[PDB]
Amino acid sequence: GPGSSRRKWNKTGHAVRAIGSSLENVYIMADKQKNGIKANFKIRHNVEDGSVQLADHYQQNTPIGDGPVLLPDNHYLSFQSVLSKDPNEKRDHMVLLEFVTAAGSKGEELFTGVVPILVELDGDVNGHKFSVSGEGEGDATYGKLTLKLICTTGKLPVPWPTLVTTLLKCFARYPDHMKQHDFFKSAMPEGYVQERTIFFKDDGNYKTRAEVKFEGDTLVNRIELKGIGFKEDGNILGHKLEYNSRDQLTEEQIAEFKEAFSLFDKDGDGTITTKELGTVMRSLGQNPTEAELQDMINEVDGTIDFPEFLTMMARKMKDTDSEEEIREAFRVFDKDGNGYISAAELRHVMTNLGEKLTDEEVDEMIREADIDGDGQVNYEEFVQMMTA
Ligand SMILES: [Ca+2]
Ligand SMILES: [Ca+2]
Ligand SMILES: [Cl-]
């Protein structure tokens, strides 16, 4: 009866959960004509009511003039973003931290140390005008970008997370001779134009034009942004998006991981040996298994860069069981997204996972989870099954 049904729910739920966000990959494609690169990627913004706002990005980058900037093979850039606040700042603001790495030239030389950054954005969204003024530093050796961004015209009329991708791929860490493949640094100092359109599902879109380039020793990102088509009551103009995640890496955790990592970076490389990973990780008070560390390693390919290392760290600490993990699992089961799991949708998932169950076993599961007696499983009824 009730005992095996709950198990079925909890174990199926566990399996679906286990499929694991600050992290996101971008496939960079060479574009031969126009002498640049292009890309398409989706960002999934969490909404305060537990749903998700999709943002579809399309991007072209082209050099500012003029001469030699060689094109890379298609490759991946991997991004991890940390958003926080400054408790001393009274203005509407974002602290942003970003860590970026590639998986498989004089401009390169301009990135060997810590580079200052100016960011400026002029925006107009549904005729609401705004500017953002920003300042920071970038440290390509560590694939690291650090920004403090302020809204100068008062209260930002859209959410901060929707401007993150708009507000410097030149600070990405390119490994050991993928550097021959680094469009963003070799375009410097003259730099490159970076254009996007971002389509927010069931809402509006942005078009942005940015110039990234050196002005003296300062790396500048100057951006014009225009938005049209948004719902005044939507997730964007209505500010219905979560700024942060509970499970997220901390700015303080990161300073410590970096000191710990650089202790073993014997060459000034921004790299540690594969065989050092255990030591480093145990000094940061965690205790990974003999074969787990192996999995972290074999997923490298013999060295680990800082963003790579930070991705490993963010993977543990990822609360397995989060309000947000449970919401995503709910969506796997509620295929038509009407807010209820029907007997037919539960069968579907079971059958697709390879979990053999009779019709009667499936009705028992529904009956067990269904508090209100309407024959289907809503989100709060689901959470009670997912929870120990
Ligand atoms: Ca449904
Ligand atoms: Ca129900
Ligand atoms: Cl976005």
Numbering used by the authors: 1 to 20, 23 to 106, 126 to 188, 192 to 325, 330 to 416
Task: Provide the authors' original text about this structure.
Earlier we described circularly permuted GFP (cpGFP)-based Ca2+ sensors Case12 and Case16 with superior dynamic ranges of up to 12-fold and 16.5-fold increase in green fluorescence between Ca2+-free and Ca2+-saturated forms. The overall structure of these sensors is a monomer consisting of cpGFP “core” in its typical β-barrel shape inserted between an M13-peptide and CaM-domains. An alternative approach is to insert the single circularly permuted green fluorescent protein (cpGFP) between CaM and M13-peptide (fragment of myosin light-chain kinase). Thus Ca2+-dependent conformational changes can influence the chromophore environment and the fluorescent properties of the sensor directly.
However, under “crystallization condition A” we were able to freeze the Case16 sensor in its “half Ca2+-bound state”. The crystal structure of Case16 (Case16 structure A, refined to 2.35 Å resolution) formed a monomer in the asymmetric unit. Therefore the initial Ca2+-dependent fluorescent response of the sensor in 100–500 nM range of Ca2+ can be determined by the structural rearrangements in response to filling of the first two high-affinity Ca2+-binding pockets of the C-terminal part of CaM. In agreement with this data, the structure A of Case16 reveals that only the two C-terminal Ca2+-binding sites of CaM are occupied with Ca2+ whereas both of its N-terminal sites are Ca2+-free. Most likely, this particular CaM-M13 binding mode is mediated by the two complexed Ca2+ ions and an aromatic residue of the M13-peptide (Trp9) penetrating into a deep pocket of the C-terminal lobe of CaM. Case16 structure A demonstrates that Glu148 contacts the cpGFP chromophore directly, which is consistent with our previous conclusions based on site-specific mutagenesis.
